[PDB]
Design a protein around this ligand. Structure first.
Ligand code: BOG
Ligand code: BOG
Lengths: 62, 62
């Protein structure tokens, strides 16, 4: 499925925010994804986080 | 991971809303999850959607 892996990454960011008791909003999702992107060395996993970040950025902007 | 499968379901609901051009908010996520729950006959998959719905409900209620 187009966007399947991205979905899972996005869903994890949302649950992670809820677990830390933070607000689920665009800013915090972005910061969480950027944090994930910066802490992954696996370029294949990095690709998935980057696409997820892009989709959130475009949804946020639009 | 505890909450791993729930994460993926929640992430899918969020992407599905963005694809249909709808607002990403609590109401619409809940409605999307209820729709998924009502259209799944696989009781193992249903269990995951039900847990995801519960988590969103409890986060929403605060
Ligand atoms: C409205 C919000 C716009 C967000 C645009 C997402 C960032 C653009 O995508 C960028 O494209 C290039 C490769 O093609 C760069 O080298 C980056 O790797 C990539 O993130
Ligand atoms: C504040 C929002 C509460 C919404 C509760 C979601 C559905 C609750 O229903 C049930 O709760 C029980 C626990 O009390 C059981 O353990 C069940 O697993 C759960 O489905």
């Amino acid at each position: 499925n187009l966007l399947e892996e991205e979905s899972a990454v996005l869903g994890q960011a949302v649950t992670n925010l809820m677990l830390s008791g933070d607000n689920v909003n665009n800013k915090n999702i972005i910061l969480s994804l950027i944090h994930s992107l910066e802490t992954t060395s696996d370029i294949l996993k990095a690709d998935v986080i980057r696409k997820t970040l892009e989709i959130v950025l475009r949804y946020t902007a639009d």
